[PDB]
Symmetry: D3
Subunit: 251 residues, 6 copies
């Protein structure tokens, strides 16, 4: 079973890890914490395909669903990640219904999409009866990061093969001419985020959001977000190190 | 100049980072914080020589001294790390004066040691005037983590080519038949640590210590330790993630 | 000389290896067996560009032509593989004449295509007179894996710069609403495969096919297929290991 | 639980995989077959520490015990592999009781050995209750592949911290001035192998053996060997490929 | 400050290194020579994303601007390189105003482009006030390598978000039906190169050029080219080795 | 055949490449030049075992003998390099007859040495008739770079399983209390080098030498040295780049 789809099917949200550092050790350790999934960022990180492959194995062993935020919404890139046992896909900068159809096409075998058949690691997980439940094993979220995406939210949500949307708040803030701050209080950005959540739920589709703090994630969970990521390993490591230095130097 | 030797020459201690995760991004980010050095652990980590090499470049760029805790006190292993721009060496499990001489021999060119000549990255850092100050550019600490090392402390300190010692408290606790707790305060281990510190200062040599928390490091700095490491990137990242999950799932 | 083009020019087919495992050791060992080429799969494998590069060197040394089944029909991806000494290109999911023109454009220098000039490893193989015979050194096959590709077979074969087609039977079976089994007996799939072979030969172009067994490859060779791949290293290794376990446990 | 120690505690032998190819995909696939352990060869392979680390994760996920045949009986090499989640250690060329004590010392924490404390991946597997069962979680076998080792068999078996011995027949044949044939049945080598097995069982210690075929492994299991490895991934892949080519090129 | 933009703002050209070999050692050594930038070639090289990442760190430490000649003009590929601290982008085979707009869009944050926000290594270099000067920190050159690009030079130069053009002479020679020789004397190619330079300067935009020799670079600098690359590490290493062999064998 | 042993058996010396940069491209290109061997330096370089493995494949394909200067004279390190197709071994810092016996033991199968059997890549090169000529296929040189080694030269040369010695002049200069200059001509060092050469030839054993220039190599070849290395790839690349910059920035 997909542990994020299990959470949803039991009427409960998913809390996810977010990794911008390559390596299997921190991936496994965070996966063993009370996270339902761990997302590997391949957009804003030095993580190439060579480095994601063993991190997906580490997350699965830790007992969380391996998710990937891809570099770009490219069909063949996403297919190769699925065949390496990425059981969740978050595609950045999905601005139109066609781009959302491009995402959906890659996540599903024919007749439902055009996904190429060679499921190396999924066939090892789910066995010979993988084809019949292949779509159920994978989670697909289109990212809302632009005024265009926000304007096209209704038509993006109408695409069948995506489970719903994942808001990128910093990029959404920036495109609306505001500060690209994580967990922004900016009234227009908060209003847009709330609007995207309501339309998603109105369409019978899931809504997720990127968070930079535990306190902000708690509010988003209380607001009824289905998928909540908190926080980037680098940001948490940087903050903890600064705090350790402060305590050590009596600052 | 060696920023740890600069700290010492201005009669003040060095605060160091400690890395068990491979990769250049967190190495650079931590190096840019108020650390004087960053130690890469090659004993209790998945970091091979292939992975340490670019991490040393990242630490130097961040503006901290690249240090390495080696797998073992092996002359040729240490020489290859120096030639890749490791400007500090912490050798584990140094139990005798001969093992401490084995360490010293690797850190210095002839006549002072038997270090092989090919300083690829040090010649790029220090230029044509590297040979004249080569010993000054490198810091060498023998690890005390056994009853044998503790018994042989005076003869270890008498070796000319080491700057002094680096206590491993958890391993020292374990060898004395106590619980290997991070920041252990078992009276026998505290007594041994205090003894090692006083003999080091009595011998006109530096003393350092591994810490798993900022609070413990502050005490060790206040106790007059010259080199204090706090804390492992993995431990800080794991603790921060647990705290972020706790805050997110809180009522 | 291109050993697959040598086979064809002597009126004889090519038997090829198929690799989904990264590493140079098995690549060399299989290359030294009675294979004319060895295909590296970059679609349904964990093999990134970093890992293909030395595998191409290993195959060439073993005395087989390095072939690559790419992730996708992308011009620049294919050009970079040619410049790393991939002397055969199999492009997946080529469904139209335009996509087949996209393939051809990447395999040929101007005026014949738009291939960028910097032939790092081919210039080392073929020397200063490489430009004059550059097209002859490379083999290009468009993959037929869809009802669209099957319907457009005539217009795909009419493209000048491709040597012909390579059938992907599992994907072709799946898109026709049948089981994605290697070496399928499904009458409609067998009929389509036979149809694609006849049109290819009628057009004076080569036809190849993916096989999962030696027995099936023998039939395809007897059917007059020019390029026959048998079998995936993973599938052969998995089957052999199961058989070794069975013999060991007296099953 | 250690699945090899589970086999032994239920009075029955362990069948193990043997890997000379680097990569996580074949490691996982073989681990999912009816093997109790999978040994990664770091002596007679291109597998460095960088490449073994993620292979140990893949084997554990597949549901077999990660074992390692090390390059050499080096304490610090073995400790670093344990801390990366190698739960079995086969040390080559153990010829004396002192070399066997050198092995034992590395596999156990103080008081029983001198193993350095930092169990990164074992603490993630076994949790907070790891230290209490740490020795139980690890399996240690000294390799017998010399006339010296064969002569010193009784004194090697008398060492407390090793579970027993692992025979290398080809190297044992070669050192006795015979042909280094896989699954050798040279009467002198068979006599020595039989002698080593009886002395091991007489000493209340385990005996294992390297096999290059399923048929030979079945005999060794029937001869009462506790740990049987069959066969090297490369050898099985090479043999299968030769057979597939033979069937394809047959009349 | 961007050291190439510093050169330009002081009314002076930039001399750049050009690297087709992966690794950090030669990158640092060349960066410490009298080069203003060092370009890493990702088109005509075995250098994947995994291998560029630490080379960018090495170049920055050496005290030259990290530049990248990308595989292709792909928005998301370029964004990921910027976020890994590539502070110059040379995009190959830019033939139209739209392709040049595609380049510009990737180099600038909203409203000026559509660059995704997550500046991992640039935020570490330039700090919290990076957003305000983000565009000034990056240099963007569209490559002129085709008759199409040459014909569209005016419309390419009119695009706001590119600093100007970088001529690829070998590809330009080849597309004009001449020999693909570095530093060609071919009158038509020299005429076209001179024409492209004049139109660039007439448009108030920068012009750069690839050179295979120091003598040719001196002429291009004297001709008023703003960005001059000389020469490929492989070509310089190959020539030097041939000369060393000649001197050694008395040839 | 071993191309260095072929040179010697035809009563003539061997010219060798020397590589401190990792990667397969420059290794192949230099191997295709008029070098008999190419030595990979694993002592004074960032090249780990992971990176040497594919470089040995590249050198063999180029048509030169893959040699390795190891980190240290360690039996098991040398055996693993032989099994990865290193057909020449230069062991640093061999100071005694016992250390030279330690080298010899690793290069030969029983009865002649104690080399462990698993010749992965040599069995692929030389086929089924490898064992009969295994010692003939490998070249072994003990390095003389200390006053101890120089004093023990006669007893080092008396060891049967080494082909002879390889002088490290810079390290020999340094140990004798002189400047470690490339191609040093300090009278004491020249005297020692001359002494080592005459004793080697008197003992019916080969003598080799490290050179940093083609001119110096020509003299050493004229002095009757059997194996001459010239020059390090880094040194040649750095010198060529400096010269290209000088010519470019010239008036
Ligand atoms: Mg975003
Ligand atoms: Mg297919
Ligand atoms: Mg070009």
């Amino acid at each position: 079973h997909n542990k994020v789809r299990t959470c949803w099917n039991e009427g409960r949200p998913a809390l996810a890890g977010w990794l911008q550092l390559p390596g299997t050790l921190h991936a496994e350790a965070l996966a063993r914490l009370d996270y339902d999934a761990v997302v590997i960022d391949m957009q804003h990180s030095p993580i190439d395909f060579g480095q994601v492959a063993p991190m997906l194995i580490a997350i699965e062993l830790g007992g969380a669903e391996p998710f990937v935020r891809t570099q770009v919404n490219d069909p063949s890139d996403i297919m190769k990640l699925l065949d390496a046992g990425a059981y969740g896909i978050i595609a950045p900068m999905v601005n139109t219904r066609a781009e959302a159809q491009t995402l959906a096409s890659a996540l599903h075998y024919s007749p439902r999409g055009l996904r190429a058949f060679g499921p190396r690691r999924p066939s090892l997980r789910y066995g010979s009866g993988y084809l019949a439940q292949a779509s159920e094993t994978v989670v697909g979220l289109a990212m809302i990061e632009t005024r265009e995406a926000l304007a096209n939210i209704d038509e993006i949500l109408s695409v069948d093969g995506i489970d719903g949307v994942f808001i990128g708040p910093t990029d959404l803030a920036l495109d609306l001419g505001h500060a690209p701050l994580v967990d922004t209080e900016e009234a227009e950005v908060v209003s847009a985020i709330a609007h995207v959540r309501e339309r998603a739920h109105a369409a019978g589709k899931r809504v997720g959001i990127f968070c930079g703090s535990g306190g902000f994630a708690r509010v988003k969970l209380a607001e009824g977000f289905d998928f909540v990521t908190a926080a980037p390993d680098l940001a948490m490591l940087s903050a903890a190190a600064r705090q350790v230095i402060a305590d050590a130097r009596a600052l």
